[PDB]
RNA sequence: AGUACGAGAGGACCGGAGUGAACGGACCGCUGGUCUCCCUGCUGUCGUACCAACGGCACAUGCAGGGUAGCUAUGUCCGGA
RNA sequence: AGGGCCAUCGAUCAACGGAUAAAAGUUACCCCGGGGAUAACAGGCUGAUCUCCCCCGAGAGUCCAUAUCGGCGGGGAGGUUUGGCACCUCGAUGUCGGCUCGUCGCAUCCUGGGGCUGAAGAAGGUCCCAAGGGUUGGGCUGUUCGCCCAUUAAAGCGGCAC
RNA sequence: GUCCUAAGGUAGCGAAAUUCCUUGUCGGGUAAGUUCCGACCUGCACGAAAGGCGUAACGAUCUGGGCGCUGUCUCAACGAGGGACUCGGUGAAAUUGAAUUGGCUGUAAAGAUGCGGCCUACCCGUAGCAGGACGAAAAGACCCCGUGGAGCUUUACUAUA
RNA sequence: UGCCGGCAUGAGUAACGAUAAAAGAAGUGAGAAUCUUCUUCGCCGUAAGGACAAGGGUUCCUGGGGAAGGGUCGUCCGCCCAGGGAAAGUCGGGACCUAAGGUGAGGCCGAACGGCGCAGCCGAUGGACAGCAGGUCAAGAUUCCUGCACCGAUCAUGUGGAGUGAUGGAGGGACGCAUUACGCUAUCCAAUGCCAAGCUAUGGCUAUGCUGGUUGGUACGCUCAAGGGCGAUCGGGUCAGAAAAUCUACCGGUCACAUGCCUCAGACGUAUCGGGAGCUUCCUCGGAAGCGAAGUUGGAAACGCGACGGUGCCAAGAAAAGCUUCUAAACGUUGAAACAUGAUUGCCCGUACCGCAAACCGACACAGGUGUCCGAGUGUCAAUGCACUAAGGCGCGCGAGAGAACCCUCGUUAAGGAACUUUGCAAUCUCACCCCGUAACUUCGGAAGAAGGGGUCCCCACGCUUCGCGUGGGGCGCAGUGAAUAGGCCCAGGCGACUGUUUACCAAAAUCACAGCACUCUGCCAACACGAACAGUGGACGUAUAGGGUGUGACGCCUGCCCGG
RNA sequence: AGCAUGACCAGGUUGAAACCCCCGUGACAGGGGGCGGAGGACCGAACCGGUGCCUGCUGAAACAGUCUCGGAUGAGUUGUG
RNA sequence: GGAAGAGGCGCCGAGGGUAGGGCCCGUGACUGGGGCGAAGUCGUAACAAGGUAGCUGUACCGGAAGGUGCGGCUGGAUCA
RNA sequence: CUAGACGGUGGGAGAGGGUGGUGGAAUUCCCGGAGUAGCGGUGAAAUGCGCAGAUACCGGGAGGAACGCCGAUGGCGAAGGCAGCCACCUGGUCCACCCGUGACGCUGAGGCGCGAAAGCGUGGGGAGCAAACCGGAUUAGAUACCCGGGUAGUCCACGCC
């Protein structure tokens, strides 16, 4: 049956993925909250 | 076993208990148009009462009167059921420039005539200043605004009672507002309802109506320790003339003061 | 033993052959099942072109019945004197 | 403005070393901290109440102590009668009952040989001795128990965290 | 008569999914009951709208019986396909101080097998069984202690839209 | 009672996975039982088929080697290694339209961040093909070979000889439910209809006993329109579809139900060339295979095509590109466009693998998993329940013996049929079609498709008989739809008026759940809801026999003294 | 839950309202059936969710299997968003 | 050489049973109603203006006979 | 053949019926007004309204239902039942002038109609008063008779006995 999740992740991409923490300008130091703030790479492309 | 027409009110049969519905209509095609309009349920950010809102939105469109006239020469010939509301809605007719939907008094075969002017024809007709109220019957289109007028959309009472004329010159009674004499001066149509008692008409069970058009609800009593008291006891309820969040259950009056109803006494209820 | 006893109903210290119980085994040859391949009975499908005639499937015999060598109880004998 | 000093006044705070002037109920949905050094169900020191015997004279037995009991009370064995203890058991031992396995003890529930019998027989009434054996099916209940139906030589009592 | 008055019991049912006290008291069903009913009424502390009764079908709700059966219980009986045994490979986890790891009766913070005193077995392998280690798991979460938390409600002290 | 790293022991036992049969010849070589060329067996085949949907991305191949994995292992993998395989103008995105909703400079407001929205883009499965069957290797297909449809398309000549540019109103694509048939073939079935490759000691027949095999769209016909809707030249919108006009609308004649707007499978329905077994051509393995014959007759279901076809119901069923509905400044007289035709086009990406599938999610290749299209068969009221073969998938991550206790699974009983026990859940029993036959209660439509009685296969005087039953003489077995398919029955007492919810894994009940009525308030740019933000709409696009809270819940009679609090 | 586009339902039984002729029938209410076609009806496949035993809790899997039901002309169910 | 007993038989029906229906007598713990007996209980609508002139029709209450909304009626004595 | 029954002409009578506007003394009250201390009601009193302006008095207003005078031995009327203007429709009734059809009729468990007030239901409705319920008060006792309120109700449609 349904599990949790399933694939298709279109709230990935103009919402939750790469260039979309824009709409949300405080969400731009969220999304720059694991890149210029403290190491590692990032999460949105592996 | 008495009104006019068609009550699906099954005594007793299978999962559809005494229904009740339509009449009789031309059946028309389908609407044209229906200018603006948008939608339903919620707003706001938020969402808004939690009792009713189903699925069909719309469909009702405005019904502009008479905002001009000057000369016009209608007919009247079909009809149509459409707005939220199971009401019927007329059909109109002329050839000029819009339409706008019109009041429907009783039904009609093929005939008619009107005229919407100021002196016209006995029958049916619409637009024209307000002294004109010898006998006041069916109204059915009855308004308050100055240059506009519309209001109404319902199949239950639409029939009022012209006062005389007196100082402040008020008239005029209202559906179900016992003695509230308003200030007035605007127009209607002057009609009946056509199928008066069908607007509340009862239904068969419940489950095709509630969710299809609005929603289910006969609750009551959240019982839930917050900001809802009423719930905490072996099965009973004691105390506690509250309704939701201390609301007060009882009349405890409202609205009051206000522009009118300061000369337009005598409101009560029974 | 219809006695000692009992004025009347009835009925022993001794043992005697005799009927029974859950209760030890045994035994197949009195009673029965069990038998999943030995046969007959029947509907549906196929393989033999096709037919008397048969096989694969229907719980690992489909459905009605039958069945030995074996097993055990209701099968029979013995058990405490 | 104030302070201290002389002295002094404001609280059944009668929770009276009170400590704030200042405040309720509820969880078998619970989570945790520990726990029989903080209960309850078994043992356990104990032995209240439990089954059984002992003392002579009042009273039944026609009178008449003991065929059988016994006003009042007196010595205890056992103690699994509902418990008094909170000793290790909360790094956790889950009521009771039901089928079956049941195997122990005897004070003996039914035989046996014996004391007596206010017992003619038939059949019992109480007691002595040891285990050799053995002790149903229905009704209800979860049933320990219990009474109701017929049986049964009779349908046990204390075992075992009943 | 009067206390209380703020008032101050009627439609139905009445050991029925309200009776402690008792399984009530009479009666049907087989012999019979903490049961099903028909009533009586001295119904712990039933009822008026979170009602009372009535009331057909229908609801994987409790109780009585019967109709043929369910052969459950008595002994249940025998057979099968598959696991328990011959052989090739793979074989872990929960857990745990350490085993020349028999018992009594006793003793011990009394539930002792390494303790007392006594008796006793040729040692080992595997099949099978539960009385056994106070069986295993989370340091009972039933409870109490804890000037612990969370959760809900009430006019608890009080904030507050 | 730590944590990781390693050694451990439970111990070699339990177990190899749904218990849905397999033997072997032979290839190979390292021996071979599970590979390969293959005759025999059986399980599914409304499937555990094939294609489309998500997924994995490397599945598929030319094949190759065990270190390790597939819980034996193995010369099999989709392990691991280089290469090979999904060839586009029309099946696929966009651009032409769109419901949740997001977003939208200005703006409606918020402490910022922002929330939202006017002109808008998106966001979808969604509106949009104008070709079908053959010739294809190691894998790919309607793009590769052949007879074949062209929607608008690239230019220019020939009836037009003159029209036309926006968001459009159109007609309409815009379809709700159910029934009935008034239509239908592929496909299926009647095979000796056409042509035959040829026949068996089996016993038996060689002939009305016999394997097998034989149409397709482009096209259009009083032998395709079965079936649903009446057509046209004069005047005007006593003032707006932000202008006009050949859309809509209404008034006066001659046609004025004298005439048509409209199709699923046709009795040329065709040009086509494929077609049984094949001479076998082939190193006479692999199979590359020359060439080639029957162009026929009806009768069974569609969720395939009529399918706004009809009546009826409504809880009253979206705005919607395109042949098609209409043009203003301007454009326009001899050329701009609609016409016929040669020529010309749809861009990159998938089009290969399993696919309700050990390969996509369950810590793994664990007996789990949900959409879409076909869906041979006789038998059977239908039957996708039920037996078995196609095509196709296949023995599943094993193998044998002896098959003690016991153990899960199945069946059959002497003696009683629930005495068993908390109560017949379980167990196990049991419930054909046709006819006649049929209650207390009852809102009579019911309670019962009740109980009960006869038959239903076969030879036959015989129907609408291309298929049932039927007045009869009778045939086999103990019994006859006979295999499989299946309400247990009845009275009564407690709760609920039955369809709905779920203890996501103990527990689905008298519990909540329905109209009716009971208390109302709001009564509008409304009460209320979320929102500090009112912006927002829900309410409804409504203003009341309307909605928010609260009570029981058919219907029938009724519903009360204490407002001290 | 709310929003949209599509979708799933082989039959039998019961077969009611509408339509029609007749009629004891003044009007006319009403009566016969015909077709009609209704009803969370009937068995129950698919479809939604489940009352109880069973194997088994390192078992197949941190998750099931076998048998009995209703929804099945609809307070039905569903793909994706 | 067509044959008696009938030998196999075809619906009748004696007769027993498993079932659904109606009917009948008795039975039945409990309960509603009518009369009997010292006229047992408490009060007293209606007979007289028997304290509302009288019954009744329906309807609620309520120890009871009864209370109250209105109408018919003369079967009401009398001077409303 | 017309005495009966039947229809014609010409007139007249009324509270016969269904519908529509309503005429006004009505009486409870909403409001302003003048603006004092009681009103009310029994045979004696009171719940109530009084210091908030009660009782009453002028006007504006909401309304529902009733229809004095004529009214008497009256009329309509099968009968039940019905006494305001007008109108659409309509029933039964009257003599004279005979017009003719020419026995064409009177009754009749069964049915159809009516269906005195009230009483059922759906929606409406509400001034006056009224079952239940509730007050001051009789008396020993008073769910009667006085007074004081009020729900269905007395009210329009339609289906019941």
Redesign the pocket.
Known sequence: ????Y???N?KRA??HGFRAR??????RNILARRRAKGRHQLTVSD | ??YRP?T?S??????????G??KK?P?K??????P?????????????????????????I?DFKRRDK????A?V?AIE???????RIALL??????KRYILAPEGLTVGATVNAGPEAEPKLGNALPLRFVP?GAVVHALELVPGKG?????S??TSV?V??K?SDYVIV???????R?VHSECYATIGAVGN??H????????????????????????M???????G??E??????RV???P?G???????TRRKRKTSD???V??
């Open positions: 049956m349904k599990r949790t399933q694939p298709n279109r103009k919402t824009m709409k949300t300008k405080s969400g | 076993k008495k068609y699906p099954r005594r007793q049969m299978t999962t559809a208990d005494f229904s519905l339509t209509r059946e095609a389908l609407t044209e148009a229906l603006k309009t948008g939608g339903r349920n919620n707003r706001g950010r938020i969402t808004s009462r939690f009792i009713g809102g189903g699925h069909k939105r719309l469909y009702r405005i000057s000369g016009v020469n007919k010939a059921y459409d707005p939220n509301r199971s009401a007719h002329y050839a000029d420039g819009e006998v519309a209001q109404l959309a319902r239950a009472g009672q006062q005389g007196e009674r209202l559906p179900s507002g016992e003695l004499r008066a008692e607007k509340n008409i009862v239904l068969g069970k419940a489950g095709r109506s509630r969710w299809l058009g609005r929603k289910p609800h006969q609750r009551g009593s959240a839930n320790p917050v900001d809802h008291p009423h905490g006891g099965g009973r309820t004691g105390a506690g309704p939701v969040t609301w259950k009882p009349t405890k009056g409202l609205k006494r005598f409101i209820t029974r």
